[PDB]
């Protein structure tokens, strides 16, 4: 479960907090996906004491709340159950923004992608398999894939230098371009490791 309490001394009515929170939640928590299992207890709360007596402009209130939620997401990802890789999945070049988000979630949730990443294996095939199952506009001949800025797959086929990329570092970016529009989105995820299995099988939680 993810629980989150946000507090602010900015003067702002409920409707002002609601906009800020909903915008912040959509761009951050709604795009944090460690193990694909959504809880029965997830809650984010935003409270205002008005104790500064300063009513900020709404865009700055929105922005402040987003930056706080976003950093919290980073921290959440960094401490995920049994985490060895902090994985960012970026889909660009989608038909719409929702398609990119759906595609990136498909990649991030896939058991073979996660296990490959646990093993430090730049397995672009697994990423292609996974994305192919996303319910979106897709041209298989136009897809490219990059790990840590290195293009291992372009135009749906292997790129020269592919199975030589070094993914030993804990931070890993997968970037997938669909080449069929200008939609894009980004998921924070983590790898599927022995510790994750251990933590979730040795005892009850």
């Amino acid at each position: 479960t993810m629980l989150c309490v946000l507090t602010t001394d900015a003067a702002a009515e409920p409707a002002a907090l609601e906009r800020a929170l909903r915008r912040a939640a959509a761009a951050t928590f709604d795009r944090l996906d460690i193990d694909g299992s959504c809880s029965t207890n997830d809650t984010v709360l935003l409270l205002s004491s008005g104790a500064s007596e300063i009513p900020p402009a709404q865009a700055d209130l929105d922005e402040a709340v987003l930056r706080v939620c976003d950093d919290l997401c980073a921290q959440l990802q960094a401490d995920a159950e049994g985490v060895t890789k902090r994985v960012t999945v970026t889909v660009t070049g989608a038909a719409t923004e929702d398609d990119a988000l759906v595609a990136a979630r498909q990649i991030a949730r896939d058991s073979l992608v996660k296990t490959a990443l646990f093993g430090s294996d730049p397995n672009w095939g697994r990423v292609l398999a996974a994305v192919g199952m996303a319910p979106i506009t897709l041209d298989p001949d136009r897809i490219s894939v990059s790990f840590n800025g290195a293009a291992v797959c372009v135009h749906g086929v292997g790129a020269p230098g592919a199975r030589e990329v070094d993914l030993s570092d804990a931070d890993i970016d997968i970037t997938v371009d669909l080449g069929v529009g200008d939609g894009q989105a980004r998921i924070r995820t983590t790898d599927l490791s022995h510790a994750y299995v251990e933590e979730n099988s040795a005892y009850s939680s």
Partner: peptide, 22 residues
């Protein structure tokens, strides 16, 4: 801490069963 002198503060938890849809 915003330069106009108001602050947003926050805490969070969660490490598993972690895929919020809010």
């Amino acid at each position: 801490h915003h330069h106009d002198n108001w602050t947003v503060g926050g805490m969070a938890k969660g490490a598993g069963m972690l895929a919020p849809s809010l």
